Amino acid sequence: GSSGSSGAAKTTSECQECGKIFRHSSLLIEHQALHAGESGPSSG
Ligand SMILES: [Zn+2]
Predict the structure, then answer these.
(1) How far is the CA of 44 from the centre of ligand 1 (A)?
(2) SS in 3 state form for the chain?
(3) Residue 38: beta bridge partners?
(4) Domain coordinates in residue numbering, the chain
(5) How many angstroms separate the CA atoms of 19 and 13, rounded?
(6) 31 CB contacts (<8 Å, ≥6 apart)?
(7) For residue 34, how far is its CA from the centre of ligand 1 (angstroms)?
(8) Which residue spans match zinc fingers labelled C2H2-type?
(9) Distance (Å) from CA 22 to ligand 1 centroid
């Protein structure tokens, strides 16, 4: 549960929607697409 929300002590392309770290943005770009559909938990 929201464990280690940092990665490897360095700015990475981690999905803030779920929390999946991706080497290069690209990887995350294709991953995010999967999300496109459901409604995210509006936090504010
Ligand atoms: Zn995601």
Answers:
(1) 19
(2) CCCCCCCCCCCCCCCCCCCCCCCCHHHHHHHHHHHECECCCCCC
(3) 36
(4) 1-44
(5) 10
(6) 15, 20, 22
(7) 8
(8) 13-35
(9) 10
> What is the distance in A from the centroid of ligand 1 to the CA of 11?
16
Ligand 1 centroid to Cα of residue 20, in Å, is 6
How was this entry determined?
Answer: NMR
Exposed, middle or buried, 12 (CB in 10 Å: 0-12/13-18/19+)?
A: middle
The residue type of 11 is: T
Distance CA 32, CA 43 (A): 18
The two tokens of residue 17 are 């929607």
The CA-atom distances, in angstroms, between 43 and each of 17, 38, 39 are 11, 15, 12
